[PDB]
Design a binder for these strands. Structure first.
Ligand SMILES: [Mg+2]
Ligand SMILES: [Mg+2]
Ligand SMILES: [Mg+2]
Ligand SMILES: [Mg+2]
Ligand SMILES: [Mg+2]
Ligand SMILES: [Mg+2]
Ligand SMILES: [Mg+2]
Ligand SMILES: [Mg+2]
Ligand SMILES: [Mg+2]
Ligand SMILES: [Mg+2]
Ligand SMILES: [Mg+2]
Ligand SMILES: [Mg+2]
Ligand SMILES: [Mg+2]
Ligand SMILES: [Mg+2]
Ligand SMILES: [Mg+2]
Ligand SMILES: [Mg+2]
Ligand SMILES: [Zn+2]
Lengths: 99, 91, 69
RNA sequence: CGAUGGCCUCCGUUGCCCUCAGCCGAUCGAAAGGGAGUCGGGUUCAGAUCCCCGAAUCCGGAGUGGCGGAGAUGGGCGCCGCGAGGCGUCCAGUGCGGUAACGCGACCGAUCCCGGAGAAGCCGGCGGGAGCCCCGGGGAGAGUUCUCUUUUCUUUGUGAAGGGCAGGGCGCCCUGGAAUGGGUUCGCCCCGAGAGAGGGGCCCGUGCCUUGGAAAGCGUCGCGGUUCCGGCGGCGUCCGGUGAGCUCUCGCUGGCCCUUGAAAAUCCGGGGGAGAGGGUGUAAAUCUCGCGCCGGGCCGUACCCAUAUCCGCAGCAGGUCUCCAAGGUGAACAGCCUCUGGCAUGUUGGAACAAUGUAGGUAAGGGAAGUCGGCAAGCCGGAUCCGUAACUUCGGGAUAAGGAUUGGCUCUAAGGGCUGGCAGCCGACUUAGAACUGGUGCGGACCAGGGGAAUCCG
């Protein structure tokens, strides 16, 4: 059993108001597994950085809506809420687009 | 346990209508609601449907009888006397 | 509506004078042949595919055929 | 019997005769009683079970009945033929299966007769099924993100009519014959007039699956007609669990009656057996079976249905019959707060805050001294645990009277299901006890009996 999800912040990084770095360590600190946010709860869940393509892999049950909630929290924290919006292209996917 | 010491079925009437009236209707209510033995099928299922109607639960036979009891003393004496008249008339 | 479960009586009802048109519905895992008669709509459901498109040319020539796209 | 038309066949149309036989009385009387049969999606400025689209259905009609299937096609004998199969004589054939409940696609039949459905009160308890509510997750979209929150909110489906299967009920049948009595309900109740135990049959199946049906609907993301579009595209419409929960409905069972709780239209079954069909076939009469053909006329249909469309002289605080009914607290359809939906304070606004009013409150000490009169106001008030007198028609009085407790938080104990004295896995609210703790405060708002002793009357 494999769970696989992707995040596409390509538009805002090519525009130049936010970068994928802060995004990635925001994930690897604040992802909690069985409620513990330390070190991704071990190697049970893996994070990978592509060219503005953030990939999350796991085998324990995971929530695409968890991922959406975390990216919304990032957008609010770094003040992009009124500019960006997180939607789903297809399954196992999210992408950030303007209004 | 014994719920009431001297009032029976008419305990449902509370403190109304008077003691003499209540104890007068007590026996009639007990007789009216009692279940009798069907003389036809032998079961104890002769229950009163209405005034003078006594229906058998399983036997499915209904009989005309008294208003509060299955039989009445007047009726049984009349039946016996009429039987005697019948046998005596033809010897 | 009436379901036809064996192959040949479907053609038997298809060739009746009453029949108006047959429409072919192609969803996943099923192929449905719906023939519209005066009283009922007769539906024949084929699970596989090869029976479906070797029957698709077995309908009478004079009967209208409509593929649901 | 007499005449006509249609290939004057067979039937129809009459006119006359024979024969057959009740009416509960013409007729009216219900837009809540009885009363066959239509549902889903879309559409308007205003109409939709009525329009369009798609699926149905009831009733009525049809010379030749339009058609299939049933009635139906077998047996005997003499034969032919190796047989298969085919000839010539007789005889039957208004269906068949199951021990039974009864079943099968139909399975002739008149006057007449019998029966059923229509067609039945109020209340109680319990169980089944839906709708709603609730809990744990997957999605999709939104809200908060000063800190926290795998977070909070919305949404997440299938008609009628067929077919099948669950699931309910049976006062239905067969075997067998039971005390050491047994089965069983919340209660009952049941049994040699046949219980338990097996095996069946029937009815309702509004639930599930399927045909309808994804093609439509809906939720999102994106392209179009720059518009006039049932526009076109992608994805999704998922998996579970529980409840003395509420409403509706079905069913079982009981209680109450000096109360026994509609009629007719209409429809159906049965008993009978008057009649009809053919002489072995091209079978016939006849079919409540399947499909096919035609039609369903007349009238109402907008809107309000009420602190503004009705009646009160009026946009009048009055009156006027009904259905639907979320979350929290709580016994509760009580009161209070909120969601869907709705509204703009009830035929005016602004500024002041005098008297007197109207409607709410609070008062030191006293506590009915006020007054005709405790009028009014005030006291009590829920629940749990104790306790409860005189008198009595023995049922009551009674929540008599009189006491104690009540918050928050952290625990403990007890009360169950499913699978394979035990083990594992799930679970719904309760009840009791304990510790700690707060400025003695805890039915903290709301809801919510003052009490006792006597006389008169009924
Ligand atoms: Mg009338
Ligand atoms: Mg009527
Ligand atoms: Mg038995
Ligand atoms: Mg679709
Ligand atoms: Mg209307
Ligand atoms: Mg005001
Ligand atoms: Mg105003
Ligand atoms: Mg007004
Ligand atoms: Mg006013
Ligand atoms: Mg004072
Ligand atoms: Mg004081
Ligand atoms: Mg004075
Ligand atoms: Mg007073
Ligand atoms: Mg007293
Ligand atoms: Mg006296
Ligand atoms: Mg009085
Ligand atoms: Zn009897």
């Amino acid at each position: 059993q494999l769970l696989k999800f992707t995040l596409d912040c390509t538009h805002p990084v090519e525009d130049g108001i936010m970068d994928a770095a802060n995004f990635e360590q925001f994930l690897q600190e604040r992802i909690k597994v069985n409620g513990k946010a330390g070190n991704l709860g071990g190697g049970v869940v893996s994070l990978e950085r592509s060219k503005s393509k953030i990939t999350v892999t796991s085998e324990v049950p995971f929530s695409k809506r968890y991922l959406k909630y975390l990216t919304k929290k990032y957008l609010k924290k770094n003040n992009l809420r009124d500019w960006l919006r997180v939607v789903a292209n297809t399954k196992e996917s999210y992408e950030l687009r303007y209004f | 346990a014994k719920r009431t010491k001297k009032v029976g079925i008419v305990g449902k009437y509370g403190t109304r209508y008077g003691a003499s009236l209540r104890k007068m209707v007590k026996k009639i209510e007990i007789s009216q609601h009692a279940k009798y033995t069907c003389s036809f099928c032998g079961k104890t299922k002769m229950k009163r449907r209405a005034v003078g109607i006594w229906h058998c639960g399983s036997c499915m036979k209904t009989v005309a009888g008294g208003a509060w009891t299955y039989n009445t003393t007047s009726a049984v004496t009349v039946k016996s006397a009429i039987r005697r008249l019948k046998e005596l008339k033809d010897q | 509506p009436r379901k036809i479960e064996e192959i040949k009586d479907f053609l038997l009802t298809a060739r009746r004078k009453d029949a108006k048109s047959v429409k072919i519905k192609k969803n996943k895992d099923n192929v449905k042949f719906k023939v519209r008669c005066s009283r009922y709509l007769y539906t024949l459901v084929i699970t596989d595919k090869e029976k479906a498109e070797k029957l698709k040319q077995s309908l009478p020539p004079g009967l209208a055929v409509k593929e649901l796209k």
